[PDB]
Amino acid sequence: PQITLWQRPLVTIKIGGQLKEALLDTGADDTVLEEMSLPGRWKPKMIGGIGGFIKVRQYDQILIEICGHKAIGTVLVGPTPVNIIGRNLLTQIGCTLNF
């Protein structure tokens, strides 16, 4: 796809067999999803946002599909304003910025 930015770049993802809406956010280093259940063990992670640093749960090697493109990578789970697909998975699906 070519996605313009006149509206928020909201796309459908699939994780855990479920469809969700998520934002493609080139300013996010990481992928951060709203509270959900994921398999396996998690590790602690601190992330810095606009308002401060917060604790999230880090899950590694998770299957996730983004606009139909398959990815397997790290997913953080915590109190985020919206599901965010950040650069760790945008790089996997081959996303670039162009102007």
Ligand X SMILES: NC(=O)c1ccc(S(=O)(=O)N(Cc2ccc(C(F)(F)F)cc2)[C@H]2CNC[C@@H]2N(Cc2ccc(C(F)(F)F)cc2)S(=O)(=O)c2ccc(C(N)=O)cc2)cc1
Binding site residues, its own copies, CB under 8 A: 1-6, 8-9, 23-29, 32, 47-54, 67, 69, 78-81, 84, 87, 90-91, 93-99
Contacts of 74 (CB under 8 A, 6+ apart): 30, 31, 58, 59, 60, 61, 62, 88
Q: Which residues from 10-69 bind ligand X, rule CB under 6 A? A: 23, 25, 27-30, 32, 47-50
Query: Choosing among ligand X, Cl ion, its own copies, none, which partner's interface includes residue 34 (Cβ < 5 to 8 Å by kind)?
Result: none
DSSP category for residue 82: S
DSSP 25-72: -TT-SS-EE-S---SS--EEEEEE-SS-EEEEEEEEEEEEEETTEEEE
Contact partner, 73, from ligand X, Cl ion, its own copies, none, Cβ < 5-8 Å per class: Cl ion
Q: Which residues bind Cl ion (CB under 5 A)?
A: 4, 73-74, 88
Judged by the rule CB under 6 A, the positions of this chain that interact with ligand X are 23, 25, 27-30, 32, 47-50, 80-82, 84, 86
